[PDB]
Amino acid sequence: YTQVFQVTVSLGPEDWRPHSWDYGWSFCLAWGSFTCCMAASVTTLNSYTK
């Protein structure tokens, strides 16, 4: 979708091309959902070692 949003702004969308492109704000927070998957995964494989 960033590959989408890069290419669509590269078209300069039909009548809406911004001087923004300030990403998210929840997409920086959706990034934080990824590392919260990762911190959840390292501790439950740590229970697998015991």
């Binding site: 960033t2 590959q3 890069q6 290419v7």
Partner: peptide, 29 residues
């Protein structure tokens, strides 16, 4: 970014290969 993001497909293709080799190890288990 566009020239890089195409390399993600074989990068995730290794991540599927990370799963595909690991699951048949359970058949060796």
């Amino acid at each position: 970014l566009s020239n890089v993001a195409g390399v993600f497909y074989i990068l995730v293709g290794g991540l599927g290969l990370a799963m595909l080799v690991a699951l048949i190890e359970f058949c060796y288990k």
